[PDB]
Structures are given as C-alpha cells and as structure tokens.
RNA sequence: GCCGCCGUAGCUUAGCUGGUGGAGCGCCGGACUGUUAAUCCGGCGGUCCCCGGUUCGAAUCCGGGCGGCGGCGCCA
RNA sequence: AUAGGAGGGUGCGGCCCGAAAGGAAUGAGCCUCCCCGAAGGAAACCGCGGCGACGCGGGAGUACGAGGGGAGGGGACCGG
RNA sequence: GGGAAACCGACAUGCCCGCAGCCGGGCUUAUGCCCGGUGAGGGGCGGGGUGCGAAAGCGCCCGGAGUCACGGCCGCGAGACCCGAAACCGGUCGAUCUAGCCCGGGGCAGGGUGAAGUCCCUCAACCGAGGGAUGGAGGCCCGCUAGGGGUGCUGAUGUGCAGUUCGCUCCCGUGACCCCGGGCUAGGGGUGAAAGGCCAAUCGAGGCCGGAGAUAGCUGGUUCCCGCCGAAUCAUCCCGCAGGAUGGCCUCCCCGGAGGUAGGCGGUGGGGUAGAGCACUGAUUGGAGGUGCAGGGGGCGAAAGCCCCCGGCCUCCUGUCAAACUCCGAACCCACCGCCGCCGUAGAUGGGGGGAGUAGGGUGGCGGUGUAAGCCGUCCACCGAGAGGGGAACAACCCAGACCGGGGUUAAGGCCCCAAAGUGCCGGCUAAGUGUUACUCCAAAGGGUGUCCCGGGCCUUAGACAGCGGGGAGGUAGGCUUAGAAGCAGCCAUCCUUUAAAGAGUGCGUAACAGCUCACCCGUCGAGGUCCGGGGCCCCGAAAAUGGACGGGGCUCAAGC
RNA sequence: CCGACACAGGUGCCCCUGGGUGAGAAGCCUAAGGCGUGUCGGGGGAAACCCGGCCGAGGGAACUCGGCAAACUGGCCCCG
RNA sequence: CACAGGUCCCAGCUAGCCCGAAAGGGUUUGUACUGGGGCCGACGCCUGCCCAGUGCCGGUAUGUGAAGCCCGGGUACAACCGGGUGAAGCACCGGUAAACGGCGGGGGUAACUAUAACCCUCUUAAGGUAGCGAAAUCCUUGUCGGUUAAAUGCCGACCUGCAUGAAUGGCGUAACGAGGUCCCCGCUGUCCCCGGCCGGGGCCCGGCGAAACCUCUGCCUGGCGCGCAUGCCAGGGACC
RNA sequence: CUCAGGCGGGUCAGGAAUCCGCCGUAGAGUGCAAGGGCAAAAGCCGGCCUGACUGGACCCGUAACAGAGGCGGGUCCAGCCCCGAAAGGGUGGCCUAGCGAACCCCUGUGCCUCCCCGGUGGGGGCCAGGGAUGACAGAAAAGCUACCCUGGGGAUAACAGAGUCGUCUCGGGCGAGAGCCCAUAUCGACCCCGAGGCUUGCUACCUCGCUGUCGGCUCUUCCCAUCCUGGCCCUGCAGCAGGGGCCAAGGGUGGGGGUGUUCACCCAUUAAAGGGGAACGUGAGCUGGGUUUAGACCGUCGUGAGACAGGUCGGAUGCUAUCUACCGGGGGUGUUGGCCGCCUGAGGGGAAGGUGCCCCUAGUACGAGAGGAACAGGGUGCCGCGGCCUCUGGUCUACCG
C-alpha cells in the first residue's frame, strides 16, 4: 500500500462496478456496526465531510478502530451505538514498478499500465456523514473526542466539524 | 565559470610585511668586544665579523628567537600590545653565557 | 514483472470427444513359513488442487486463484 | 586612458564642410503682427453640492489647437 | 457513335423555363426601378442510336466545332534545380612494400656448460667401486659484437626529428636465424607458424580507367523587387507512418445566375451527458420483525420421529452506495420551417478547370491513462505565420490585430523612487518586513486565553470570574478478580439513605487499609460575567546546497492587505 | 640514396688483428685519418615550471589495482 | 598460433584429392616407410557410456522415382491424355562417437537429532564413469583453515558443479617464459614530506620566422530562456 | 399456442421425468460475444415448402461530413415458383462478426472470333462460379555483425542536466499500545499530511558536425536536517556514563587491511574519526585499475555464423592560450599646474588559530561499594598557520683530499 496521493481527489473517474471488470480486490473492513441498536438513544452526533475525497479501505478500518476502541474501553458496549455508514466501492489502479535498475526498466510507460486492483475507496463529497454515533447527553464528551481523532485520518480535512444533529 | 583567488599559484613570496609577537629582550648593551664588568655580558661579536655584515660597534640589542627579514635589512621594534599572562614577564633575564664563535 | 506447463487412491504416475478411473508403491485382513522375510491370495479410499461459468451433466472445456517447473530479466 | 555590450534605428546636441550635381538674395536659418482653424479643449473668477479625494452651472467650445493665407524685419546659408 | 468482337448505326428541333438583350405599360429630375411578352447563349423533359438484353431497366452516346500556331504553368521519362556515400560491375596494372616458394652468395665479439664417442689408474675371481683425462653435441645459456625483435617506462614526442621516432630497460643473437641479388604466385585471386593479417602512406576483398552526372523517401544550398490573397501540420489507403497518392483546407481563371443562411426568437422534431436514485440489469454494507425453506451444530433426544433449537436460503419497514445500471433527467448540441437580421444582381450561392502545401506547440475547459510530469483525444483563444503596449525579463496570460506622416484621446495596467502619473480619500485588517508575485513565479494536515467580528445559551446581590477561609458524609473494604485491588491493575454493576455538600470518586500517593486533594458548597471582596460555535487576518508547522533577494531600493496609521 | 625536408629514421660488403684495457669487433682514453656545418648566436649564477640526471636523515611500500618506476646485487676466484 | 608426439580417414598410379572455359595441369624425377585431408597438441597416467538425433558409409526385394523409348487412346498429322518400363535419389535395413553431439528428474527409509549406504517411480539413446571442483559457483566477502594487527585477495580444503569431465581431450607435470595472480628477504624518495644541486629548455636580446583557428567582446551573480547565459531582466564591480 | 421461476395437491428417501390448479410483463427463448429487437411473437408446436431463384437497377455502408477498391445491405421493377382462403410475404437465417483483388487456372451456359478461303482439331474472348494472398486494398523471402561501413536523427536509447518524486531521505499530526504504577523519559502499530532532491524509476525538454565514463588522485568553494567542539532543555538526570531534544558551519571530522569500487566490511587509534551538492565537482590536471573496441580462453546458449551488464588475461589518453578568469610583475593616464618624502584608514580578507592531555583540585562532592566530577590556577602535546638557519639534519658541479 503506497502512500495516499490519489485518495484525496475525486477528479479521477469511476471504475467501480466489480461484476464488470475482471479482477476485483477483497475488503479489509468487516465490521461497521457495533454496540446497541440505534433505537435506544435520542441524540445524534455526526462528523461531516467538507471536502471531496476518496477514502481508502485501509483508512476506514484504522480510523474506526482507534475510535471504537476508545468508546468501548471507557463507556462499554452497553451504551453508545456507532456506525460508519460508508462501504468503499471505487477500485484503485497501479502501474507496475519496482527497483531492478541497470539495463532493466521497471518501468514502463505503457504495455498495460492499466490497473491491477490495489483496493477499494469510498467517495465522500460535501455535507456527507462520514461518522454517525448515537449517544445520550451523559455520553456526549466521549463521542466528540472520538470524532476529533477520526478527522486527522480523513484525507483532506473537515471544516463543518463535529456536528449536533441534534437528533431530529 | 571563474577562478577563485584561494587556489595555489606562483607569484611573489617574501618581501612581505609581518608582525611577530612576543620576543623576549635578552640583552642591551653598547660596544661590542670587551666590557670591563663580567656579569650582564662580557662582550660580544664573533671574531671575523659575521657573514654579510660589517663591524658591530655602536649601541645594540640581542632579542630572542627569529627576527623577520634579511641580513642588512632595516627592522623596527614595537612594544608588545599585551604579552602573555599565563606566562609572566620577568625583568632582566639571567644570561649564563653568550656565544663567541662565527656563524661560518 | 513477463511467456509456457502441472496437481489424479497415503506417494508417484497413466488418462479424459465433457457421461470414464487405473497401474507400481505404501497400508490392511487371510495364507505359506517353525517364526519371518521374500512369496502368495482379498481389499479399499480419488469432491481427479481452490473457486467461478457453460451444459441436461465438467475429473475433462473456458475465467479467476494457490503452490510447485522451465525460458527473458537485456544491446542499453 | 570612469566607465556597458548583436556593434544599430529613430530623434536631438557638439565639433567638422559644403564650389560643383539642389532650393534660396526675385530672400536661408531666424524675428514679429493678424486672420482662418479638424479632432480636441483649460484657468482665474463666481454660485451650489459632495464626510473627502473632488464635482456641476457660467466663463465657454472661449484661450488654445494640427493645417492653410497675407504683411512686415533681418541678411547667408539650409537641407544634406 | 456504341460494342470485347460479330456487327449495328442517331434530334440541321417536339415540349417547357429563363440570363443577356429586344419589345410594351407604369414610375423617379435623371440614371435607375416594378410588372408582361419575345427569348440566341444556357437550363430541364420527351423521342432517338447502340450495348446488356425473352422483357424490362440502366451503361455510353445524340439538334456541326475543330484543327493548326505561339508563349507559359504543371505531370512523367530521361542526370531532370544544384551538390553531396558507402557500393556494384566490367576491362585493365602492381610482389622495387610486403608474404611465402625457389637459385645462387654473404653475415654473426667473447665467454660458459659439457652429452655420445675414446682412454688410463687403483681396488675385486667376477660383479662392479673411486679418480682423472680426452672429445666435443645443443631449434643451448650468458651477451646492449654486428644484426633481428620491441617488454615496461603507459616515460620523452604527440601542429613530432619521425604520417609510427627517441633513450633507458628488455627478448634473440649458429639458428625453425639474419641478409643481397635473380626469379615465381594477382584481386573472391594469392599468401597466411591463421591476426580477417599482408598483397607499394589504399585491405572483413588493392589500385586505375570506364559504366557514371548510379541512386538515396536522406543532410546542405537554391540567387531582383513590389502589390494582393493567404494555409494545413487532418483524414483514408499504402512492406506504410522521416514518404507517396487522394480528399478537407488554401489560392488562381472561367462558367451559369437568384438566392445564400455564420447570428437570435418561435414552432415541429432528435438525445440519456450533469445531476439524481431504487424502477430494471444488478453488484454490495448492517442490525430488528416474519419464522415461508433447501441443512452444518445440540437437546426430552425410544431416534430423518412428535418439539424447539443455532451459520444460513428469501419477504417486510428500514441500511451503504454502485464508468461499462436506469423510474427519471437538465443546461447544452443538432435536423427543418417561418420570421427578423445579414449577405447578393459591381454576380453571391453553386459548377468546371490550373497550382500547392499530409513533424505541430500550446493555456484553459471536458476528459481517457498514469502517484506525477507526460502520453493520447476533443473544443479552445493563440503561437506557427502577427508587430505594438503591459505582466521585471519571458513563443503562446492580458490589451491589441499594424499602409505613410501629423495632431489627439483612451485600453491593458499603473500613480513612493528608479520610471509617466496620488507621500489619494473613507473604513477596517496587520506587527509577520506577513506582503509589496492573477504570471511560468501563488506549500499542507494539525494547531495558538494572537487579534478583529458576527450566533444562540447560560447567567447577574436568587452576583465563582478568578482569588480566598472552611469543604471533602453513610451502606461499603462494593463485589469479583486476586497476595491485596480496601475510590486509585483491570471488569462490571454504578445503585440506595441523609443534606452546606457527597463521584460505588480527579490526580498524587502503597503494588494493594492510610495520608494530601478535587469536583461541591455556604461564603467574604461586591461585578458584568463564564460558555460553546462560525468568519477574516496574522502566528507555528516551514531545513539546502557559488548570491540571498517582492524587478530592485526600501516600505510598517504604508509605498502593505 | 630513399623518406616532399641537408628528416635523430632506415639499406649490402669490406677495414672486425691500431695502442692502452680487459674474456672482448665491449666501455673509456688515446694513435693514423676525419671533423668542430650531427650548422643560429648571446645574455640572466638562470626565480617558478618541464626534461635528462645527482644526493637525501629517521623510518623501510605506510604509496598504488599492482614494489610500476626506481633501487639493490654485480666482474672474478674459492667454498658450498 | 606453430610444434615434436598421438589418432581417424581416402587412394592400387589408367588411383585418390585438388586446378583449369578448354586443351590440359599440380602432387610427380612422387607410388602405401607414399602422399593427400582433418582432429588433438611434448612427456606421465588415461581416454567410460550412447547410433535416439545430425552426419557419413554400405546395401536395398518392395513402394516410389524423370526424360527417352513402348503400348493404349486422341489427332486425316501434331499438341494431348493414360499405363508399363522407372536409373541415381527417397522411404527401408545395418554399421559407425580419438564423426557432430548427449551423458535425467522426484518422493520414502538406519540404535538418537542428522544424513541416507537403502528402496520405489518415469522421460528420451544412454544416465557423468577415471578425474577434477566455490574453478581463467550465480547467490557470495559460502564455510573452515593458513596468511595479514587488520586481507570482498591468494593459497589449501570441503564441494550439494546456478551453468565440470575425458583426442569439441581429462588429470597431472620436470624443464622453460619481456605471460596472469600471491608471499618473503634484502633494498630502495613510491610514501610520511619534501629540499638542494646539475646540464638542456623556460625568460630577455640580436637575426630568422610558421600553425591550429578566427561574428564580436572589460565581467560577475541570480532570475529567465531549447529547461547547463558575458550580451535579455534586476544588482554589483569596472580607468587603459 | 405462451414462458423462466415460485405456490398448493400428486409420486419419491429426496429428486427427476411425468400430472392438476394458481401466481407470474419477460427473470425464458431466439446457434454462438455483447448490445439492441420481440409475448394473441421473430419465441413454442405442426403442416407445407425450398426465393440461400434469374435479370437488371437505385441507394447506403465500406471510406460520416469528403476522393476510396473488394465486399455487404435496404429498396424497386421484369421473369419463374412457393406458401397462404386472402390480403399479403419471400432480394436466406430478427439485427449488428463469420472479410478476399489484378493476373492465372479449372467449371458452366449461350454467343463472337483464330491473319486469301472452306472443313476438322486445338486455341483466344465476352459472362458467372470456384481454387490464395489471416502481415487480412494481395511482394514469392532465414540469421550474425564488438570487423563494420553509410545517410541521417536528440523527431529516439546509454551518460549528465532540467521536469517529476512511485522509491529514496528527512520531517509533522493522531495516538492503539509497552515502559514498575505512568501514551508522550523512552519505545511506538494502524492511518494520515508535508519538505527535499542525496538513491532508484518515470520523462524525452536539451545534446548524437564528439557538453569525454567511473573510481582514484590532487585542488578549492558551499549546504545543515550537526559526528566533535561551545552554549543549552528533559530524563526512568546519584556519580562517572547515556537516551532523547534545541542553538550553532568558526574550526575539526584522520591512518591503514581487502575490493576497480563511489557504498560497505574490518583493525588499531581518536574529541569525533557526520552526511550531501559543485559537467553522479575535478581527463585543453594526473592516473587509467574497472565499464563498453578490435587478440584469447572457459561456462551456457545456438545447426551454424555467432552471442553474453556470465567469469577472465591484454588492450593509446592529442593541442604552442585569440578572448576571458585569477596570481603575481611592469608602463602610463584621471584625482583640475607639477614634484620629493611621511601618514590616514573607507573598504576588502582571515581560522591563525583549532583541539586534546596532564597536575593541582581530589581519591574530594555523590555513592552501600565499585566507582568518581566541577569552578579555578599551571605545565605540555598535536593539527593548522607564519618567520627563521644560529643548533642540529639535508645539500652544497666554491673548495680540499
């Protein structure tokens, strides 16, 4: 996994449709819902995306984990409900090249520069809900902290922030 | 695409001005050749002169170590601006013996 | 990273037009033998590597995947 | 013999000349008065606004103005 | 004239438009105009000839203009605007260089070693043993003899002394040696102790002459001026992509002759890209409620049992979003008409004929690929091939499309000096010399009780905002866990009583009863207060190589933003 | 002579037994014989630098791909 | 490279091989102890195994195999059509590797951990033998040892050789070499670290007198620009 | 005439084929990719039938617009059939892939023709079908060249530069977790964002009428993200010694052993033995070992020629400075009429100095002990640097033996 310098843009086009193309990659995310059902709470905090991006399957799993881990330890899974709504669908492409030097290329311009699948990504526009956590007002302070931690691993930035829905 | 001035080349060497610091004044007297007292010199000058210098007969000074210049050149003497301080000056240094052989 | 080719009884190998499945080896139960070896009858397990698809049905024919075999990895 | 570069073009000083092929003594460089005059176009000064910078009306399409005509003085070069 | 040939054989005009002109009327002072005939030239039918053809239907042709001459443009063949190489081939000429072969001659200081061969003495029957002599061989040694070679110095030279040299050092130096003269072998041939070496300053096939002005899609060059118009660097085909041809396009001449439709409005049509979403094709994320079912785990299992059970297969309200999905669907492009506009009778629009040119770049938009720069499409101002003015300079950013000379006024952009023009004006930001750079010139997430300004809450003598004086309950050591977990590893419950007030406890402290302390609270001082959340701007983040620089200086209530 | 040049090149013989030397047609010196036209001179005690060459303490290849270059040994007699 | 030595091959001279347009010719005043052609390259010890493939050679009933002739047909003749006859050649058989060349893979197993003397299997003719080997072996500075204080070296050894091996010669070798590499002793300006000297140049004068090459010129730095500038742009230095 | 699939009844272990009813706008099917078309059909079933017929056109595609061959198709009309009651349809398969020339030969039919003329054989020709060029608008066609040669090209590789920055280096944020309790003394996953241009790769902008390769040597400048030195902060900082961070380029940053080696490995020292840029600094300076000539060998490959970034021995390093650059040296002008001598000091340069050791402190502070500082005051050593030759070395072509 190369550094993200292509997952930070949406000016790159679509190549989602896994059935259509020969060769598709696996996921890394399996777990998306955690805690109690979302009908046992009143208030809704979201993290809102203010920038268009593509968010990597790797970043989604990492960000969720570090967050969910903090919520689980302090609060317990007897309280809160946390969801990261998105599934990544956008397939990502690679030009083959590694060190080999000397007379060797590696390479290569064309001769099939066309992707082998790296991964998957989720397309996040402006005012989307990247995270939605459900809480009570006892459990407010934990949900905000967790969201702050999310935002760094967001490919660009937030500018709409940590948002009180309030729960309408 | 130039030549620096710090790269080694031929040109003048010598006939350059130099100030060398902290040379001890061994001695002052006048003559030379004979003095009637036996301490603070007994009097100088090798016989046969020196190679490339005339007769010494007038007031003189004998200074420690190297003096910058050629034989027969005018030298001027400058008091020190400050001398060592980890090594004190001590007045009239004790002169055990003076040469009397020629440089040749 | 490229381009060929495999995997089939515990092992090694035949085989396939898509309607099949063996051999030698090991192993197991009897039998010669005093016992045993050798020898000698009786056997069996195979999704014919994973995973899609077409078909009325795929071990076989195409897609993909995995491990193992060769051949280029250079005049530049 | 303190001063910047495709070695020049364009415009103007200094010095230099120019009899000859050019215009000019039947008047050159030059001076001065008057008028006509395309496009353009003020000021002083007056009154009133504008927080201010500054603007309007009148002066006034006047003064001025490329370009054109007449007269007049001086007296030798002017272009090149 | 048609047909391959056999072979056959046509309109000196039947019909209709209409340009020019003629003829007529109307009209304007006139030219000129509007409308009706007549209409050569021209345009459109019919009928005709012939070929194919049972036939039909087309193909080609049909109501008389060409020939010759002169100049020039252009194509092709020729040397073919000019020059330019490596070849190939044919006939010739070299072995005074050099290679080997042959005849006949010659050269090579000195020194060493010491074979065979031969001899003798002493000692032994013999076998032999010891010693010495003599002789003199060698593709032999030493050797800067002459002579031959040429290893190292990578030295000297390296426009030399020299187009292959010099000195020291070094190899050979009676030989498979060197050398002279004569003589032999010649170019796909010789010769080669064989390196593709050598065969006369020329050898992976010598030289000379001729073919020969070879031919090259390839490099270079192609010469007087002026005026007018003024490109394409695309497409299809190609042993073709460094080239041709043919179109688009550019330009020139001629012809016919009344419209033509770049722009905009409306009408009538075409359409699945933006966007959007569950409506399909249909990929996928997540948990409830149906318990409609194909089966891998368990149970009273008396045994596929009656009965429930758990991956799960698929309805439902819901749950993520989908180049190559679509219930839908813009802006927008495009066909035709009408209208207006515009353009034309100083002839457009269309037709025929002569001449080319088939490396692109580039900002931006929209892309496709690609981490990117770049590549490749597409439209695109523009550069090519277009100055001038401005962006410091700067192919393509901005302004602008340029006959000469003059007067004037603005554009772009700028008004602190350089350098024309503002020490402009109002208000606000700024303390970084941020910036003074739309450019080709322009660095981020994160983050600052740094400022300035909008929000709606809390809340104010029912005054904690900070200080300050006193605080800091009981079950309970919560239990588990565990040595201990006694608020204070960790897990989970996190409740109940009593009130300044009290968290199954904030940090310290023991590893774990304790101790210090907090949230908290009445409260003194007697107020305008604490929050949180958007925004502008400035700060941190922010290190680079000969000199650092916003163009420079320098600027800080500006000459900045 | 030949190499375009009066080219440090390179082409045969003969004098190969001159004297001294010493194994010697060797070196050096020297005789007969030849020449001072291996054809440009002079100056600076002549510095840097370059070619030939001489000498370097102490250390004894640490240099460098490498003891390359250079040095050392040295003739002859005896022992072995 | 030659080379002596070794081997394979061919030819009965009216030969073989080779030259020549031809006549004719070389070897050859030669005759198998000849003379022609290859391979290997002194000596010492040796030279395994394969004829599947290539090549060469000998032979070939049979099939097959041209033109000619023959027969049939056709044509008034001819072209023409068909069959037999069909030589070398091919298919076919054998020999032949000091001819060109080849000379393999997996698994399982031993008092104990290791390995496997051991045993299976199959291609394609045969299955690497005597030897030698990390090489004039990739990985790689293998590993161990010698050697150096310290050595990606050298040398010795092991050896599983990425990709050795027997006349496309293997191994080993006294003597020999202006051959490649390594060590030791002496020695030594190669070096630490350079100096001084000497002679010829340099440098000046007198006389004599060329060439290479030639848009121009007093810059430096940055920026820009065909992206590696004296000349554009902005600074600075600047008398010849 | 209407289907996949699903439901309920039937048979079976289940299930199949088979059976009955109900739902069911297309999920079926239509040869075959894909897409498009279609439900009283083009699908399904059954019967009949053979138009995938002959001739000759228009038009379109091919090849938009816009020239363009072969090929295909729609669409007429004539002729001959077919089917259907008829209308009416049939120019092959619902559409879009299944494509093939000049010339030649063979086929088939009818017709022309073969040199004075007739007849016969055997020819030519008009037309159509069929036989190949899959490199598919059709040549008849294997390799090597480091022995090369030529025409050219930076329209295009190697090298260096520029651009870029995946990789590379470095840096930042978040903070899962470990460190005795304690995220942040220290260590730090997942993930995310930047800077540089020092490795590699991408690019083809520059250069192919030659900007000479590496490495080394020698010589000099610069950069800091700093190895030491100086001045500092934190600490799981007792000391002494570390770890981690800041400031800082003034100075220093070595010698050897292997390798062609930049790198790297090792030895012994050292305060420390930092990294990177300058045509991967440095060939009109050297060196020329290595890379990539022409000789040769081995291994592999190849029939062979012959090849190899496989291994290996050997393999030349040109030039008299016109301009400019600097080091040094002259001759003169300008500084306002000239001159002889002495000064000032705008400015320019610098490292002239760097660094270590030892003694005293002190066997002290601190420490259980082992061990063991500092301030301050002295002495020295080395490296760099400038002068000097008396001492002592070197030389000394004065000279003497």
UniProtKB/Swiss-Prot annotation, chain A:
<dbReference type="InterPro" id="IPR018255">
    <property type="entry name" value="Ribosomal_uL16_CS_euk_arc"/>
</dbReference>
<dbReference type="GO" id="GO:0003735">
    <property type="term" value="F:structural constituent of ribosome"/>
</dbReference>
<keyword id="KW-0687">Ribonucleoprotein</keyword>
<dbReference type="Pfam" id="PF00252">
    <property type="entry name" value="Ribosomal_L16"/>
</dbReference>
<dbReference type="InterPro" id="IPR047873">
    <property type="entry name" value="Ribosomal_uL16"/>
</dbReference>
<dbReference type="GO" id="GO:1990904">
    <property type="term" value="C:ribonucleoprotein complex"/>
</dbReference>
<dbReference type="InterPro" id="IPR001197">
    <property type="entry name" value="Ribosomal_uL16_euk_arch"/>
</dbReference>
<comment type="subunit">
    <text>Part of the 50S ribosomal subunit.</text>
</comment>
<comment type="similarity">
    <text>Belongs to the universal ribosomal protein uL16 family.</text>
</comment>
<dbReference type="InterPro" id="IPR036920">
    <property type="entry name" value="Ribosomal_uL16_sf"/>
</dbReference>
<dbReference type="InterPro" id="IPR016180">
    <property type="entry name" value="Ribosomal_uL16_dom"/>
</dbReference>
<dbReference type="InterPro" id="IPR022981">
    <property type="entry name" value="Ribosomal_uL16_arc"/>
</dbReference>
<keyword id="KW-0689">Ribosomal protein</keyword>
<dbReference type="GO" id="GO:0005840">
    <property type="term" value="C:ribosome"/>
</dbReference>
<protein>
    <recommendedName>
        <fullName>Large ribosomal subunit protein uL16</fullName>
    </recommendedName>
</protein>
<dbReference type="GO" id="GO:0006412">
    <property type="term" value="P:translation"/>
</dbReference>
Curated annotation (Swiss-Prot), chain B:
<comment type="subunit">
    <text>Part of the 50S ribosomal subunit. Forms a cluster with proteins L14 and L24e.</text>
</comment>
<comment type="function">
    <text>One of the primary rRNA binding proteins, it binds directly near the 3'-end of the 23S rRNA, where it nucleates assembly of the 50S subunit.</text>
</comment>
<protein>
    <recommendedName>
        <fullName>Large ribosomal subunit protein uL3</fullName>
    </recommendedName>
</protein>
<comment type="similarity">
    <text>Belongs to the universal ribosomal protein uL3 family.</text>
</comment>
<feature type="region of interest" description="Disordered">
    <location>
        <begin position="82"/>
        <end position="104"/>
    </location>
</feature>
<feature type="compositionally biased region" description="Polar residues">
    <location>
        <begin position="93"/>
        <end position="104"/>
    </location>
</feature>
């Amino acid at each position: 996994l190369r550094p993200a310098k292509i997952d930070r843009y949406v000016d790159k086009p679509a190549y989602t449709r896994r059935e259509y193309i020969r060769g598709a990659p696996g996921p890394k995310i399996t777990i998306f819902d955690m805690g109690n059902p979302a009908g046992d709470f009143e208030f809704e905090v979201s993290l809102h995306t203010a920038e268009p991006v593509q968010i990597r399957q790797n970043a989604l799993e990492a960000a969720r984990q570090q967050v969910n881990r903090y919520l689980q330890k302090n609060v317990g899974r007897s309280n809160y409900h946390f969801k990261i709504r998105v599934y990544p669908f956008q397939v990502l492409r690679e030009n083959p090249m590694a060190t080999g030097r000397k007379a060797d290329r590696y390479g290569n311009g064309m001769r099939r520069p066309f992707g082998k699948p790296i991964g998957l990504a989720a397309r996040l526009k402006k005012d989307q809900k990247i995270l939605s956590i459900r809480v009570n007002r006892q459990h407010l302070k934990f949900a905000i902290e967790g969201a702050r931690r999310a935002a760094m691993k967001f490919p660009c930035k937030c500018y709409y922030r940590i948002y009180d829905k309030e729960g309408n | 695409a130039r030549v620096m001035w710090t790269v080694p080349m031929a040109g003048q060497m010598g006939f350059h001005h130099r100030t060398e610091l902290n040379k001890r004044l061994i001695a002052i007297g006048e003559n030379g050749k004979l003095k009637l007292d036996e301490n603070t010199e007994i009097e100088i000058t090798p016989k046969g002169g020196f190679p490339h210098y005339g007769i010494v007969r007038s007031d003189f000074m004998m200074i420690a170590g190297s003096v910058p210049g050629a034989i027969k050149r005018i030298i001027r003497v400058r008091p020190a601006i400050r001398p060592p301080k980890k090594k004190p000056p001590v007045q009239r240094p004790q002169i055990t013996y003076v040469s009397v052989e020629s440089k040749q």
